[PDB]
């Protein structure tokens, strides 16, 4: 049967970038041509593989990561990028093989009173390793005094809200991102394009 790409792209809501969802796709036939021409995409960049060649290739597993960021941060979802999102929220490896797809979701993720449900990790001591997901809410220690789970001076909550409003500039508007990873182990492949 067909691979469930529609469950990821057409999901009625998306996760925050710090708690990005991952869908493991296996043992199915994938129709990439219909998927990539379904909706209109503002960002479509592939790395290490052509999007027309996927219909001919087979992989052990295909990963479909999805999350929401703002417009000025879509450029960070790429191999070799740095920034608050790429370092503390979602990191792709330098030899990432796959495609990153994004589209404007101002109609879906922005509120009149502001949508503060989408968060991103603002404070973290070290950078995330490739494909790392940190959902910790421990109080960040910015000084020499321990915080002991209490917010205060040099003691910050590590998550920060976006606050999406439909009248903001396109750089501040919410964008839903889908990152397709194509893993090729030395094991029998289960996902072939067709």
């Amino acid at each position: 049967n067909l691979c469930p790409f529609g469950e990821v792209f057409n999901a009625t809501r998306f996760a925050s970038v710090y708690a990005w969802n991952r869908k493991r796709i296996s043992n199915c036939v994938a129709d990439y041509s219909v998927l990539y021409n379904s909706a209109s995409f503002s960002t479509f960049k592939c790395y290490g593989v052509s999007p027309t060649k996927l219909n001919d290739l087979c992989f052990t597993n295909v990963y479909a990561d999805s999350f929401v960021i703002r417009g000025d941060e879509v450029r960070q979802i790429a191999p070799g990028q740095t920034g608050k999102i790429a370092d503390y929220n979602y990191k792709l490896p330098d030899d990432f093989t796959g495609c990153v797809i994004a589209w404007n979701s101002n109609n879906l993720d922005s509120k009149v009173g502001g949508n503060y449900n989408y968060r991103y990790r603002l404070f973290r001591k070290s950078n995330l390793k490739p494909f790392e997901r940190d959902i910790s809410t421990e109080i960040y220690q910015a000084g020499s005094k321990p915080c002991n789970g209490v917010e205060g001076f040099n003691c910050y909550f590590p998550l920060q809200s976006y606050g999406f409003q439909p009248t903001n500039g396109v750089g501040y508007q919410p964008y839903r991102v889908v990152v397709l990873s194509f893993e090729l182990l030395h094991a029998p492949a289960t996902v072939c394009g067709k």
Epitope: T12, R13, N107, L108, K111, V112, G113, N115, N117, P166
Partner: antibody
Framework: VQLVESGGGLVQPGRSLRLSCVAS????????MHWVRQVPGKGPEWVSG????????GYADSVKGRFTISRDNAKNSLYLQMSSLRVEDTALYYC??????????????????WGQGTMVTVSS | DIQLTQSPSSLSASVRDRVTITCRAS??????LNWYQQKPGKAPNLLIY???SLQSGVPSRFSGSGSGTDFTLTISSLQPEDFATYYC?????????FGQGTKVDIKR
């Protein structure tokens, strides 16, 4: 896909009732939930709503301070605690699924799936 | 807190006629307005969301338009089964408030 209400019935004014709603056929956690009531022979009145992760809750002014909406995501259930039932609260109470997840200002916020409703009769 | 006023409150039209219902908000609500059709003894069915977007499975003879404070629901060609009360519903701010409704009747 269904929304089934229970808990309604005959109740004396000033008493309390707890309405329940059992959801099936869709991801209950994926959508906001609302209560809308309709007095026999009259129009509709929205009663209360809840985001999903309890991130937002609202009440009609006529019921604020007396009603409490809540949801149990693990049980796919929506609840409405109706302390101090006035006669003006007598109506068929609909359990309704919202289109998305906001209860304030989503252009998509709509009442897409409606339960059959449970009757709450408040009178001496 | 945001008042919705529909005009007319009652309407009489024959089959094949063009029906237009007006809904005015007390303050700007952008495109955050929905239209509902309710037959008596039934739950209200969603017709239009986001002022002008058709609901799935709703016949294309229904269509909505407008933004800000003035909106219109239109039945391009009235049908026998389209007799009902039509409500407009703002989703701009809380509390969620309805219009008083427009009862559409088949003209005799």
């Amino acid at each position: 896909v269904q929304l089934v209400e229970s808990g309604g019935g005959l109740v004396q004014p000033g008493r309390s009732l707890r309405l329940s709603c059992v959801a099936s056929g869709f991801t209950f956690e994926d959508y906001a939930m609302h209560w809308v009531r309709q007095v026999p022979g009259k129009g509709p009145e929205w009663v209360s709503g809840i985001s999903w992760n309890s991130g937002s809750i609202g009440y009609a002014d006529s019921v604020k301070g007396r009603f409490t909406i809540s949801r149990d995501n693990a049980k796919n259930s929506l609840y409405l605690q109706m302390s101090s039932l006035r006669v003006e609260d007598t109506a068929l109470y609909y359990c309704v699924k919202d289109r998305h997840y906001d209860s304030a200002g989503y252009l998509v916020n709509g009442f897409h799936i409606w339960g059959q409703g449970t009757m709450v009769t408040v009178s001496s | 807190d945001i008042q919705l006023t529909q005009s007319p409150s009652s309407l009489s039209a024959s089959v094949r006629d063009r029906v237009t219902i007006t809904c005015r908000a007390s303050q700007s609500i952008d495109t955050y307005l929905n239209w509902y059709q309710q037959k008596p003894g039934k739950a209200p069915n969603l017709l239009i969301y986001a002022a002008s977007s058709l609901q799935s499975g709703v016949p294309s003879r229904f269509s909505g338009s407008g933004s800000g404070t003035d909106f219109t629901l239109t039945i391009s060609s009235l049908q026998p089964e389209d007799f009902a009360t039509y409500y407009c519903l703002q989703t701009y701010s809380y509390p969620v408030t309805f219009g008083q409704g427009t009862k559409v009747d088949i003209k005799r």
